[PDB]
């Protein structure tokens, strides 16, 4: 990744001249996105190698940095019809990414780093990796929200569960704010986001009390306390 950083920088300079309105440019960009997605290797069951620092992980980190640069210039501000090209590129990128199920891979990598955080607390490459793997689903969902014609990604309850668990970590000074804003955007209303967060916090504190009394000897048997 480090030695190929100049390479994808050159790719970025080459793509800065691409116009999303032309069919040839859009097709070439879509092919490049599909090739990068296939390079991501979400089908790999070898998640254990994703936790350790490796060349493949750094290459993937550079890949999402390049993709974030691509979708970070979608501001209609001072754009000579560029706004339209940026919107088309954003929509095509979101469709290609979501249709490939990289979101499930995001869930797997998040739950893998959750084990790392659990192990480290009880006994800045990581920060950048976590920020990118949280920003990519955030940006994808934002783009799909801006374009209702793209089918919405399906988020079951587990995603909220680990996102809340990550929120319980007090080692996140600002990205915690970003995750909170992400969740209130996902719910769409502050009421539901706060309701889920409070419910998880209460459930976690309650099981904490339960197990703390279990270990001491106050046992909850059939909802009856036995000392």
UniProtKB/Swiss-Prot annotation:
It is found in: Cytoplasm; Cytoplasm, Cytoskeleton; Nucleus. It comes from the Eukaryota. Transmembrane segments: none annotated. It is linked to Episodic ataxia 8: A form of episodic ataxia, a neurologic disorder characterized by episodes of poor coordination and balance. EA8 affected individuals have attacks of unsteadiness, general weakness, and slurred speech. Additional variable features include twitching around the eyes, nystagmus, myokymia, and persistent intention tremor. Inheritance is autosomal dominant. Belongs to the UBR4 family. Component of the SIFI complex, composed of KCMF1, UBR4 and calmodulin (CALM1, CALM2 or CALM3). Interacts with E2 conjugating enzymes UBE2A and UBE2B. Interacts with RB1. E3 ubiquitin-protein ligase involved in different protein quality control pathways in the cytoplasm. Component of the N-end rule pathway: ubiquitinates proteins bearing specific N-terminal residues that are destabilizing according to the N-end rule, leading to their degradation. Recognizes both type-1 and type-2 N-degrons, containing positively charged amino acids (Arg, Lys and His) and bulky and hydrophobic amino acids, respectively. Does not ubiquitinate proteins that are acetylated at the N-terminus. The UBR-type zinc finger forms a pocket that mediates recognition of type 1 N-degrons. In addition to substrate-binding, the UBR-type zinc finger probably positions substrate proteins in the proximity of the bound and activated E2-ubiquitin conjugate to enable their ubiquitination. This is E3 ubiquitin-protein ligase UBR4. The lineage of its organism: Eukaryota, Metazoa, Chordata, Craniata, Vertebrata. The chain holds residues 2993 to 3258 of 5183 of the full protein.
């Amino acid at each position: 990744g480090v030695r190929a950083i100049p390479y994808m920088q050159v790719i970025l300079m080459l793509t800065t001249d691409l116009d999303g309105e032309d069919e040839k440019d859009k097709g070439a960009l879509d092919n490049l996105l599909s090739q990068l997605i296939a390079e991501l290797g979400m089908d790999k069951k070898d998640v254990s190698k994703k936790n350790e620092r490796s060349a493949l992980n750094e290459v993937h980190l550079v890949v999402m940095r390049l993709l974030s640069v691509f979708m970070s210039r979608t501001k209609s501000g001072s754009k000579s019809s560029i706004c339209e090209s940026s919107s088309l590129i954003s929509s095509a990128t979101a469709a290609a990414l979501l249709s490939s199920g990289a979101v499930d891979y995001c869930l797997h990598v998040l739950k893998s780093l959750l084990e790392y955080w659990k192990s480290q607390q009880n006994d800045a490459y990581t920060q950048l990796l976590t920020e990118m793997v949280l920003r990519l689903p955030y940006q994808i969902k934002k783009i799909t929200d801006t374009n209702s014609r793209i089918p919405p990604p399906v988020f079951d309850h587990s995603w909220f569960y680990f996102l809340s668990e990550y929120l319980m970590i007090q080692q996140t000074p600002f990205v915690r704010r970003q995750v909170r804003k992400l969740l209130l955007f996902i719910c769409g209303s502050k009421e539901k986001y706060r309701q889920l967060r409070d419910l998880h916090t209460l459930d976690s504190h309650v099981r904490g009390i339960k197990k703390l009394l279990e270990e001491q000897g106050i046992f909850l048997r059939a909802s009856v306390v036995t000392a």
